[PDB]
Design a protein around this ligand. Structure first.
Ligand SMILES: Cc1cc(F)cc(C)c1Oc1ccc(C(C)(C)O)cc1-c1cn(C)c(=O)cc1NCC(=O)NC1CC1
Ligand SMILES: Cc1cc(F)cc(C)c1Oc1ccc(C(C)(C)O)cc1-c1cn(C)c(=O)cc1NCC(=O)NC1CC1
Ligand SMILES: Cc1cc(F)cc(C)c1Oc1ccc(C(C)(C)O)cc1-c1cn(C)c(=O)cc1NCC(=O)NC1CC1
Lengths: 115, 107, 110
């Protein structure tokens, strides 16, 4: 059989080196690279309305510091980042269209994930 | 479950969160605490801050190397301090818990 | 993800080279602002140092051990590209590279 097996690439590595690295470069990334700072924008309600916060900053730390059990867990944190943003903001805001753009892209990049 | 993941996410998270963790979350600062002989007596100092950093930054060859570091932390404390001491009773509690958690180590 | 090979590069190879007398110029980027080298970041299109390599091993950057080896090579060749041969600094890299090549020969498989 001259057909050799398709290359075995790790999923979480791909998440760091490919998925995250793409989202991070993108022009709309900056509001998601650190946590939402609810002091410095006047919003003392943020932390009551958002159960469990999330950002690419934290996802990056986690990929770099052996946090994630499996690639499923890392994806959860991405979804949670977006869904946090859609809840706490009023649809058709600017933050929401930026998040919708990063999500469209996210789902492209996830679809080409290895196995 | 890779054993080193279990040590980071379960063993250390449990211990780090405990009442008595704080004296163990960073190196014993012999200068601040004004203990000149500490580094002479304790040849291999150790603490949860350093073990955490090691788990996060791929230092350990395997789980047993990481378990020895926890044991070093506890015994270092039993060597340097006198029994009965507050610091010792705390380390004793953490050891008890550390051992319960190590009994559910996957293989 | 972290193969026993990458483990060897962190614990044995990098640790050995970091401790050597000649390491210090390769422990962080060449600060070309400080040294008044405007041509450096123009002649060296892919800078490397052991600082960056240490970071990358600690933070699961590498696809595999061989990508890390590539970084070490680039570090040494960057040095040989920018600097006149015979300079103090080149002889230092050569010393470290000789030592690298020794340690890399005992690299385990899988
Ligand atoms: C406030 C704001 C004005 C803009 F023009 C564009 C953005 C993205 C804005 O949102 C942020 C700007 C800065 C920051 C910092 C860097 C401080 O964390 C965060 C946000 C912001 C980010 N995320 C993820 C959100 O879900 C919501 C955010 N702010 C919404 C906000 O404060 N809205 C107030 C007008 C009502
Ligand atoms: C000094 C002390 C007084 C107390 F009332 C309780 C504790 C735990 C104490 O121990 C420590 C307090 C702070 C620190 C800091 C955080 C600065 O590194 C360390 C210790 C301490 C911790 N561990 C693990 C030790 O083995 C020994 C420590 N020092 C005890 C000490 O100085 N003992 C001599 C004064 C008798
Ligand atoms: C300039 C110099 C003089 C010496 F006596 C020894 C060394 C290693 C020297 O090189 C460096 C000294 C410091 C630094 C710092 C730490 C600031 O980034 C870098 C270098 C240096 C390092 N590496 C890896 C190089 O390839 C080249 C470096 N300097 C080249 C240099 O500045 N040459 C000047 C004559 C042009």
């Amino acid at each position: 059989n001259p057909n050799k097996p398709k290359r075995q690439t790790n999923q979480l590595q791909y998440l760091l080196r490919v998925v995250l690295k793409t989202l991070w470069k993108h022009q709309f990334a900056w509001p998601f690279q650190q946590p939402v700072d609810a002091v410095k924008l006047n919003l003392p309600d943020y932390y009551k309305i958002i159960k469990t916060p999330m950002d690419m900053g934290t996802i990056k730390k986690r990929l770099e510091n052996n946090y994630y059990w499996n690639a499923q867990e890392c994806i959860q944190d991405f979804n949670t980042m977006f869904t946090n943003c859609y809840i706490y903001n009023k649809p058709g805001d600017d933050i929401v269209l930026m998040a919708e753009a990063l999500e469209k892209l996210f789902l492209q990049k996830i679809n080409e994930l290895p196995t």
